[PDB]
Structures are given as C-alpha cells and as structure tokens.
Amino acid sequence: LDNGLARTPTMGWLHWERFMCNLDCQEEPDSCISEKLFMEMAELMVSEGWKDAGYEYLCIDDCWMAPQRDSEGRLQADPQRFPHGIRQLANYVHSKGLKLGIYADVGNKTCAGFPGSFGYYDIDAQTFADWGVDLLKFDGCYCDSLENLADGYKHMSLALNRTGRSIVYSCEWPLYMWPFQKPNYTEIRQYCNHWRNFADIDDSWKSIKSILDWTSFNQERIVDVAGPGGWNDPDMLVIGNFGLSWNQQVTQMALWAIMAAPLFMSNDLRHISPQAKALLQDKDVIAINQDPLGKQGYQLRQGDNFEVWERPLSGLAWAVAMINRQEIGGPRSYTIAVASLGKGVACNPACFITQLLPVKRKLGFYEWTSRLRSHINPTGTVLLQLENTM
Amino acid sequence: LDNGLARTPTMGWLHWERFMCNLDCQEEPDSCISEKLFMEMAELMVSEGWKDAGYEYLCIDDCWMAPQRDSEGRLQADPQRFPHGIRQLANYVHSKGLKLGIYADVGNKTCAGFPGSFGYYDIDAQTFADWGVDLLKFDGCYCDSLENLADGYKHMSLALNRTGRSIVYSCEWPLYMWPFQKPNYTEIRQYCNHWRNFADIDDSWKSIKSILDWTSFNQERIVDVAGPGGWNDPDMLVIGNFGLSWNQQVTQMALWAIMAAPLFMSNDLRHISPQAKALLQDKDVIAINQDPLGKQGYQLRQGDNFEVWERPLSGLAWAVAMINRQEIGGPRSYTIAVASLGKGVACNPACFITQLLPVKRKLGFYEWTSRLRSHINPTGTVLLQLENTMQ
Numbered sequence A: 001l002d003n004g005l006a007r008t009p010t011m012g013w014l015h016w017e018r019f020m021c022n023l024d025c026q027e028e029p030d031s032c033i034s035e036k037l038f039m040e041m042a043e044l045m046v047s048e049g050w051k052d053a054g055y056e057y058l059c060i061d062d063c064w065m066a067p068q069r070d071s072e073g074r075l076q077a078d079p080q081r082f083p084h085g086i087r088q089l090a091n092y093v094h095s096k097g098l099k100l101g102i103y104a105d106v107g108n109k110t111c112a113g114f115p116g117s118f119g120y121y122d123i124d125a126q127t128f129a130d131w132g133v134d135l136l137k138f139d140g141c142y143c144d145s146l147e148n149l150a151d152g153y154k155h156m157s158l159a160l161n162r163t164g165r166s167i168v169y170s171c172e173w174p175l176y177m178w179p180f181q182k183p184n185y186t187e188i189r190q191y192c193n194h195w196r197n198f199a200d201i202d203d204s205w206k207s208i209k210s211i212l213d214w215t216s217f218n219q220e221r222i223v224d225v226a227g228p229g230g231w232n233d234p235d236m237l238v239i240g241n242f243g244l245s246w247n248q249q250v251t252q253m254a255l256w257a258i259m260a261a262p263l264f265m266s267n268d269l270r271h272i273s274p275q276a277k278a279l280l281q282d283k284d285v286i287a288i289n290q291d292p293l294g295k296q297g298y299q300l301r302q303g304d305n306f307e308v309w310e311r312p313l314s315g316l317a318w319a320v321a322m323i324n325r326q327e328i329g330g331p332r333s334y335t336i337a338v339a340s341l342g343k344g345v346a347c348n349p350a351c352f353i354t355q356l357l358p359v360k361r362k363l364g365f366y367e368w369t370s371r372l373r374s375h376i377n378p379t380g381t382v383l384l385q386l387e388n389t390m
Numbered sequence B: 001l002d003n004g005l006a007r008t009p010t011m012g013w014l015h016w017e018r019f020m021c022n023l024d025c026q027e028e029p030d031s032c033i034s035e036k037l038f039m040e041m042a043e044l045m046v047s048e049g050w051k052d053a054g055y056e057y058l059c060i061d062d063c064w065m066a067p068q069r070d071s072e073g074r075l076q077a078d079p080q081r082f083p084h085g086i087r088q089l090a091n092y093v094h095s096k097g098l099k100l101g102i103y104a105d106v107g108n109k110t111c112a113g114f115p116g117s118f119g120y121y122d123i124d125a126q127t128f129a130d131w132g133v134d135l136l137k138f139d140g141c142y143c144d145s146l147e148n149l150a151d152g153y154k155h156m157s158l159a160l161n162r163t164g165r166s167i168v169y170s171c172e173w174p175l176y177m178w179p180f181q182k183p184n185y186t187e188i189r190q191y192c193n194h195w196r197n198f199a200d201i202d203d204s205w206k207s208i209k210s211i212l213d214w215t216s217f218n219q220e221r222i223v224d225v226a227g228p229g230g231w232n233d234p235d236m237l238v239i240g241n242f243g244l245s246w247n248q249q250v251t252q253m254a255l256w257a258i259m260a261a262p263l264f265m266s267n268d269l270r271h272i273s274p275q276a277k278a279l280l281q282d283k284d285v286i287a288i289n290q291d292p293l294g295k296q297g298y299q300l301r302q303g304d305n306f307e308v309w310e311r312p313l314s315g316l317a318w319a320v321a322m323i324n325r326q327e328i329g330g331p332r333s334y335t336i337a338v339a340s341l342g343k344g345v346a347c348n349p350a351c352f353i354t355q356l357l358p359v360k361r362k363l364g365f366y367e368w369t370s371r372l373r374s375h376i377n378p379t380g381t382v383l384l385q386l387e388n389t390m391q
C-alpha cells in the first residue's frame, strides 16, 4: 500500500505469541492483557534502548476489546483491563515517543470471539483514527465467502486513508484465500503494508521450519511483489522466549532479515536474556532487514541438508544465509563458488565478506574465482554480507 | 545381567550423536573419529571435573574399526586413525582413572558397514577382554532372523563373563525385537546391564518428545524390569549441543533422572557452554538418577498439555517432574494435591519439597492436605524432591 508507510519492514512488538489471550488478572495479573501490561512494556522499549535500535511500534492483538459496542455502536476496550481507554493509552505511548497498534477483524468476530467489524469498517476506522492509532492488524476470522472477505479488506483499506490518519495497515488477507485459490498479490499489495501468508507461529523450531519451507517453496508468487510499501510477513519473532535453542534463534533473526519481513517481537522484554537482547538489537543485522532498497531475499540452493539464502541490498552489496538443516551430529562445513553467488555480480571481480553472524568476523577479500568455505552448526545459520570492490 | 555391574545407571560419554561416523581427518580433523580425539576427551572429563561428578565411562561407537580382521583373524582398529591399536589408548584412559568402552555388532556388519562379529563372538570377546575394555555397546544391524539375533546377544553375553574381565554389557537387542514380538525383558535382563528400546536420538526437541511419549506409553512392560544390574536405556544426553533450548535441556536431564536411565553425554566437552556443564553435573540431580534403590519413575498424569512424572527414591523421598507440553504462549501454572502425589505416602504427614530444577530453590514444608502450585515454562520442566518428615 503506497501510503508512504513501511518504506522499510515495520519494526515493533506484538503481545500475541508471548501472552496470547490471557484474561485472568486475578491469579495472573502480569501475563494478563491490560493497559497496565503494555504501559509497562512501552516504558522498557525506551529503557533498554529498543526504540534506539529501531522497534518503534507497540501493538495490541486480539482480546483487548470489551464484549460489545457502546450506545454509539463503536468498539470499546474491556472496561476492567482498559478503564482509561485506548486514546489515553495512545497518548502515553506517544508521550514515550512510540506508536500504538490495535487488532481488529474483518468478519463477524475476531479469532477471539470478540466484536467483529462487519458493516462497521467506516465507523471503526474513524474511531481508531480518533483514538490516535498508528497501526492496524486486520485479522480475518469469521466471514461467508471471499466476497465478504476481499471486499472487507479492500473496503477498510480505503476507510482508513479516508480518515486522514497515517495508519500502517497490516493484512492477513492471503492466509485466508488459501487453499481456495492463489491470491492476486499485486492486488493485495495495493491494499496492504504487509500481509500474513502462513499459519501462526509457535515458540518452536518446527513452526519455524515449516514457515521457511513454505516461503521457500513459494517464492515464485510472493518473493516478487515484495518491496517498499508492501512486505511479506512470516510472523512475530519468538527470539527471547524458550522454545528456541541458541543456534535456532540466530536462524530466525538471520532469515527474517533475508526476507525483508516485518520485525515484531513477541517476548516479555522485562525478563529477557542479555545474550538474546544483543542479537535482537544487532545494528548490522537490523540494517540488512531495514535495507532501503526493499528487495526480498530468497533461497538459492537446496540439497545435502543445506539451504542457501540471499537478498540483494543497496550499493551492490548482498546478504547471504547458510542454514544447516541437519538436526543431528555437529557443525558441518559448506563451500560454494563465490562467483555463482550474488547472481554472478557481487564478487566480480572483488568481494569483501564480513561474517555478520553468528559472530561478526572480518573475512578477507574474495576473487570471482575464490571459493568460500565455512562451517555451520546444526539448526543454526551463518549470515554473511558481501561488498563489491567497485 | 547380574555381574555385579551397573548396580546403578552407568554414567559416561559416547561419541555417537555428537560426532556420528566422521572419517575425513583431512578436511574435518576435529570431528574425525580417531584415538587422538578420545585422548583429548579423556583428559578433559578429568579436567573440568566430569569424573568427580560421576561420568566415568568414555566410550567409542561405530566407525572405530578398520575394514577387516587381520591374519590371526581378530579385529583391528583403523590403522591410520588408530595407529596405536587400542590397548595403549585404554592405558591412557585407565591412567586418567576412567574406563573405556567399545562398539561392536552382532550381525555381519556394524550399522556402519564395518566388520560384524557373526561367528566371532568368543574371539572378539577375548580380544576386547585382552585390550583392556570395560564396556561393550553391542549393536544389532544386519542379521537373518531373531534366531541369529537373540542367540548372538545371548551368546556374546556368555563369551564375556567367560573372559573374566568385568565388562558392562549394553545391548540394543529390544530395539531390534520389534517388528516381531514384544521382548521377554526378564530374559534380556539376564543378559544385559542395560538395553536400548527406542530409535536413535537427534539433537532435536522432536526426537526427545517422541522418546518420552513412546516411553510414557509403555511403562507397563518396561518400567518394571528396571533395577540394579539392568536398566532401560533411552539414549545419549544431547545437552551441550545446539538442538535444544534451555528449557528443553533441563527437561531431558530431569527426565533421564526420573527414568533411571544410563547417563551418556554426546557433546564436545571442549566447546561446551558453562551453563550447560553446570546442569550436566548438578550433584543433586545426578544423585536422583543415581539413586541406590533403582526404582524407575513413570508418568502419573496426562491432560491439558501437562505431564506429571515421578520416581520413588530411597528413604521415603520422592522425585517429581512437571513438563509443560505447551509449545506456545508463556509459563503456565500447574497445581496438584500434595497428598495424591507420592502414591499418597510421601507427604504423610509432612513433605519437605526443595525445587531441584530448574533452580534448586528451598520451598517450605507441606502437609498431607497441602496444595502445591508452581509455574512451568513451555517445553520446560520443574523437578521436585520430596522427603518425608514430621515438623
């Protein structure tokens, strides 16, 4: 969506994966979804310098709303968990320099069961627009046929621009067309800043593998329509939780960067490993994912439990991934023709490769004939960045 | 096998999972399976105090052997990767105060393709016995019918006892009885210090989950025949590698302890996290697994993505596991009736529970009535130890 927004993969935090739809603010007041929760989080992003690194969007997902519309017929946050109301929440969020995001649903209900938005789009839009929202996650649970769906996404999309408020619009449209018919991504892209493609994501290696395996096996349709204004969105970053091994975490991070994917954490920033936060904030990696160019990466090679990904950057510079899909054993070694890498370009004739992960080391120069070798840990990933001698 | 060995779950290291069958000592010398490597390892176990914690067995798995017998007919380690035959290495192993273990195969070939042992049992036995071996991993790849199999395991078993050398014999027999018939474990137990039951183990969470679930859904047959001399063996400990997250590592360790399982690491003790080594050596946890009693634990409860395991120990003390099988979200909380725990016993009248994992904390006293509540991380595990008293 060309609204001059998301001219770079959006960076922020989303409560979903880490807190799901928790409401028991009795025996569990800290995992409970409340303005108190976010308010805390907001503080932090600023504290441990998350904002400084790039994450600037704090967003609420499903289950933030009270059971039903008000006398006026607009939504309303749960009275008990959000007594002061979004608006005010937003103002704090803004006071702290951040931007707020809210969750909504095109159909008759959110995947949570709460209020939908069907035949309310316009109203709701103005609502948020007035509440002071900056970003909308438009989910699509509950709706007759794509007619109601497609139209709803499209419709709402227009409703917002109309409001005048600059709102990053994040669709989930595609994820729902499957498996009835491949979506017209060129279409969608004219309506979203970024959309979901695959199922949600567990705090697990499996869930991640499938997503890659999926985005791998589909680049034909998606990898292309990617670029400023509109991005392909895998899902939140579960790095900092528990389901992932170390080498599994670098992987997600490394690859989300390769796939110009929106960066949304879903972790408790209050209790997060230092080792984790380090990765999550690596200036050089965020830079790659935040490349101004907006050219989504893709899998180059397959075979021998090895995956080779790469994304062209700006200035003849290229980013490259090396995933060791071998669940057992130890660190294997992979070697490739420096030349037949950056589509032949990057490295002609000179190349400067600096391992940017998992240890940002300074490898030497590489000739077009030079052959590159490196070892990769099981389920891990070695991220490289190449510079051409120009 | 009542040979006065493994009167406690055997503790050691086995190169398999961490190094598999690596032979390229040209372009991959560090992973390469050679006497040089084992010598290093040996040294270390002693260094960072692994020996002190309990691990006392250093074992070689498949791919340690040269292509075929010698003139005499016995077995010979690969000439190049094992220039000093075995014996000598065993002296260095023995020197450090450790015990060595070697891999062999009942059939015509090891799962690697190397020399078998079919119609050589006796010879081989004496061989190892001579070489100064302390433990044998008898694998079972390649063989006609269980006839050849069952007999081979049984046969070899006797061959060793005969040699006179005290050799911990670790079978894989069962893993190979399926798909034919559930194993006369009472039989097997009269021939092994411990045997394999389920497929190999990847450096992955999945591989572990399946083993638990598989074992979970079989206790009827196995959990019972467990005790001194003979143990149920899951597989190596992949803690210290990369496939497991933190919460996932405590789990394996916590549960192997619950399942009086042999403790065999498969990691590079050179490049091993400090945080890892800490767990692997936790005195209180090793103690549980090393319980003198020899009563294998078992899953008590199911449901809601929660698993409750427990093993009775010695002195009216009980060990308890709490696995959060919920792959997504955050740390949930589980609460149970202190009473209906240690089969009703432990916690009558008082129960002193000290979280022994993942943070060994000192919880207070608990009465029979008492209700114990605790939160558990996703894919993680909270290990508890209850002792009986009367304050």
Ligand SMILES: *[C@@H]1O[C@H](CO[C@@H]2O[C@@H](C)[C@@H](O)[C@@H](O)[C@@H]2O)[C@@H](O[C@@H]2O[C@H](CO)[C@@H](O[C@@H]3O[C@H](CO[C@H]4O[C@H](CO)[C@@H](O)[C@H](O)[C@@H]4O)[C@@H](O)[C@H](O[C@H]4O[C@H](CO)[C@@H](O)[C@H](O)[C@@H]4O)[C@@H]3O)[C@H](O)[C@H]2NC(C)=O)[C@H](O)[C@H]1NC(C)=O
Pocket: B106, B107, B108, B118, B142, B143, B144, B145, B148, B149
């Ligand atoms: C390891 O590999 C060994 C080699 O066997 C494989 O197959 C042969 C044909 C080659 O291709 C070889 O390269 C392969 O590796 C394997 O040894 C084999 O073991 C079986 C079981 O003992 C033998 O089969 C039997 O053969 C007899 C004939 O003579 C045997 O018995 C006499 C007296 O007991 C001995 O003096 C001989 O040395 C032989 O051992 C058959 O009588 C019998 O067959 C029955 O059914 C047939 C079918 O109609 C009837 O005709 C017979 O009368 C019987 O009723 C068995 O089939 C086989 O001879 C032997 N091979 C060799 C070369 O000796 C060994 O089993 C493998 N190890 C493991 C653990 O699997």
Ligand SMILES: *[C@@H]1O[C@H](CO)[C@@H](O[C@@H]2O[C@H](CO)[C@@H](O[C@@H]3O[C@H](CO[C@H]4O[C@H](CO)[C@@H](O)[C@H](O)[C@@H]4O)[C@@H](O)[C@H](O[C@H]4O[C@H](CO)[C@@H](O)[C@H](O)[C@@H]4O)[C@@H]3O)[C@H](O)[C@H]2NC(C)=O)[C@H](O)[C@H]1NC(C)=O
Pocket: A002, A003, A004, A007, A160, A161, A162, A163, A164, A165, A166, A167, A228
């Ligand atoms: C409702 O929908 C309409 C329809 O699109 C929107 O209209 C767009 O409004 C945005 C608002 O700025 C316009 O964006 C501007 O585009 C310029 C065109 O350059 C683009 O392409 C070049 C080359 O590819 C790039 O270098 C450049 O980055 C752009 O991608 C830009 O030059 C403008 O950038 C300027 O502003 C930014 C922000 O301060 C500065 O950082 C830059 O240095 C520069 O000064 C800007 O991005 C867009 O062109 C309009 N398109 C159309 C079709 O009208 C409305 O915005 C929307 N209404 C609401 C409320 O959302």
Ligand SMILES: *[C@@H]1O[C@H](CO)[C@@H](O[C@@H]2O[C@H](CO)[C@@H](O[C@@H]3O[C@H](CO[C@H]4O[C@H](CO)[C@@H](O)[C@H](O)[C@@H]4O)[C@@H](O)[C@H](O[C@H]4O[C@H](CO)[C@@H](O)[C@H](O)[C@@H]4O)[C@@H]3O)[C@H](O)[C@H]2NC(C)=O)[C@H](O)[C@H]1NC(C)=O
Pocket: B002, B003, B004, B005, B160, B161, B162, B163, B164, B165, B166, B167
């Ligand atoms: C080949 O196979 C034989 C047959 O099993 C092995 O012999 C066994 O060796 C173990 C090793 O100790 C013996 O186990 C010990 O038994 C003691 C009791 O002995 C009585 O009961 C046994 C069992 O029926 C009878 O065989 C025997 O005649 C006795 O009546 C226990 O007291 C031991 O535990 C306690 O004592 C030991 C010994 O001092 C201490 O070390 C312990 O800490 C503990 O205090 C232990 O359980 C077993 O008894 C032997 N059985 C037989 C039939 O001989 C051979 O060792 C084996 N040979 C080779 C080369 O491997």
Ligand SMILES: *[C@@H]1O[C@H](CO)[C@@H](O[C@@H]2O[C@H](CO)[C@@H](O[C@@H]3O[C@H](CO)[C@@H](O)[C@H](O)[C@@H]3O)[C@H](O)[C@H]2NC(C)=O)[C@H](O)[C@H]1NC(C)=O
Pocket: A184, A186, A187
């Ligand atoms: C997916 O949706 C996009 C968005 O509409 C479709 O692309 C657009 O398709 C229309 C036709 O329906 C094109 O209109 C044509 O424009 C030319 C001049 O540009 C004119 O000469 C023709 O008479 C006609 O009006 C439109 O240009 C085109 N826009 C873009 C940016 O591609 C696309 O067709 C849809 N995909 C599929 C498979 O249907």
Ligand SMILES: *[C@@H]1O[C@H](CO)[C@@H](O[C@@H]2O[C@H](CO)[C@@H](O[C@@H]3O[C@H](CO)[C@@H](O)[C@H](O)[C@@H]3O)[C@H](O)[C@H]2NC(C)=O)[C@H](O)[C@H]1NC(C)=O
Pocket: B184, B186, B187
């Ligand atoms: C598994 O194998 C074991 C032995 O390897 C089998 O157990 C054996 O069972 C017989 C009974 O059928 C026992 O013999 C008994 O001997 C007494 C005298 O002491 C006699 O009075 C009885 O009539 C009987 O014959 C034998 O001791 C016992 N062996 C062992 C080691 O316990 C068992 O049958 C096999 N299990 C299955 C399911 O096949």
Ligand SMILES: *[C@@H]1O[C@H](CO)[C@@H](O[C@@H]2O[C@H](CO)[C@@H](O)[C@H](O)[C@H]2NC(C)=O)[C@H](O)[C@H]1NC(C)=O
Pocket: A106, A107, A108, A118, A142, A143, A144, A145, A148, A149
């Ligand atoms: C929400 O549910 C209502 C009621 O089930 C859907 O409305 C029906 O729409 C069909 C056309 O698809 C009409 O023939 C019916 O008369 C409608 N019934 C009512 C009570 O309005 C509505 O379409 C659903 N919304 C979505 C997005 O699927």
Ligand SMILES: OC[C@H]1O[C@H](O)[C@H](O)[C@@H](O)[C@H]1O
Pocket: A016, A061, A062, A110, A111, A112, A139, A172, A199, A200
């Ligand atoms: O109901 C809440 C959930 O709804 C969908 O499943 C969505 O894909 C998830 O990310 C989350 O928003």
Ligand SMILES: OC[C@H]1O[C@H](O)[C@H](O)[C@@H](O)[C@H]1O
Pocket: B016, B061, B062, B110, B111, B112, B139, B172, B199, B200
């Ligand atoms: O090749 C050696 C391997 O053979 C089998 O697969 C066995 O289960 C493994 O533990 C290992 O010993």
